[PDB]
Design a binder for this molecule. Structure first.
Ligand SMILES: Cc1ccc(C)c(C(=O)Nc2ccn3cc(-c4ccccc4)nc3n2)n1
Ligand SMILES: [Mg+2]
Ligand SMILES: [Zn+2]
Length: 313
């Protein structure tokens, strides 16, 4: 009960910032997560022996892939920690509990391949789940580990509270399907502009949590340029391996996934910032103004990509 986690002074300070990097020491991430749960939620939210066993089991069921790995899981969880700690009064006790657990679990057992490739490969997960194929799998792994003996971190919640939090974690994980972002944001953009957005409307909260989940998932674009620049190598490492497997199926992949089309990368990142990243963080700041730093960081990186095309680096 009185066993607090404490971080060294550079981390303790930098961890409150949106652009914080969790660093290259794998073994510190579990303690980084727990620190955040305690400060974001409270020291009572979870049983420390249960939480740690949950965490190390989640770690185990992430794979050794270049991008969609254990570091991505903790990085997305930290972005959600920054958002919750800059919006102290807007979210309930269950939402703060569920969303940090949702984020850590969002990409559980990812192979480094898009829904599209599973479909075209005719993977068994595609037959079992026709849309949001990987995200329905990710949630299935989360329920699986939650049920493993000694892992039920929600064991003090009532029957109905436990269902609410699992429903928060489900919607949360499905929302990380980028194919569902476009319409979710457009709907929020209207609701804000026509001024009909209402945070007490449960269908409205679900949407806003969905956008938070996209925001946190894409948070590589919201870091300082050297972290953004280097993370992009891992993202493209996966994309090119997927293209290789598309070619192996007898299908030219899109240029984004064709490693013979590296020259177009800078332009492709512009497309993405302009089409996905800026619209995401614009709309999120409109709804949650204290998340303006993500928008600012995103625009800075956009400018850095323009500079790359211009041959200034
Ligand atoms: C930093 C980050 C985080 C998350 C995602 C999902 C992406 C992402 O989607 N990036 C993208 C999108 C579309 N792209 C298209 C291209 C292209 C390349 C070479 C020739 C033609 C076209 N690259 C792309 N990269 N990028
Ligand atoms: Mg995902
Ligand atoms: Zn993710």
């Amino acid at each position: 009960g009185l066993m607090q986690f404490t971080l060294p002074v550079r981390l303790c300070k930098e961890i409150e910032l949106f652009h914080f990097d969790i660093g290259p020491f794998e073994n510190m991430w579990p303690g980084i997560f727990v620190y955040m749960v305690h400060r974001s939620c409270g020291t009572s939210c979870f049983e420390l022996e249960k939480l740690c066993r949950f965490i190390m089991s989640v770690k185990k069921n992430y794979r050794r892939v270049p991008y969609h790995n254990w570091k991505h899981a903790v990085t997305v969880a930290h972005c959600m920690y920054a958002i919750l700690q800059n919006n102290h009064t807007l979210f309930t006790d269950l939402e703060r509990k569920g969303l940090l657990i949702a984020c850590l679990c969002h990409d559980l057992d990812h192979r480094g391949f898009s829904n599209s490739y599973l479909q075209k490969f005719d993977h068994p997960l595609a037959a079992l789940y026709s849309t949001s194929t990987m995200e329905q799998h990710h949630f299935s792994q989360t329920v699986s580990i939650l049920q493993l003996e000694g892992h039920n971190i929600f064991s003090t919640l009532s029957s109905s509270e436990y269902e609410q939090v699992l429903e928060i974690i489900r919607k949360a994980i499905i929302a990380t399907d980028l194919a569902l972002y476009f319409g979710n944001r457009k709907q929020l953009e209207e609701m804000y502009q026509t001024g009909s957005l209402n945070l007490n409307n449960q269908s409205h909260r679900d949407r806003v949590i969905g956008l938070m989940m996209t925001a946190c998932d894409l948070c590589s674009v919201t870091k300082l340029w050297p972290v953004t620049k280097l993370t992009a190598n891992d993202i493209y490492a996966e994309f090119w391996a997927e293209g290789d497997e598309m070619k192996k199926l007898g299908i030219q992949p899109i240029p984004m996934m064709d490693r013979d089309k590296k020259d177009e990368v800078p332009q492709g990142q512009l497309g993405f910032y302009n089409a996905v990243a800026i619209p995401c963080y614009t709309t999120l700041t409109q709804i949650l103004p204290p998340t303006e730093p993500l928008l600012k960081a995103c625009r800075d990186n956009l400018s850095q990509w323009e500079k790359v095309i211009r041959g200034e680096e």
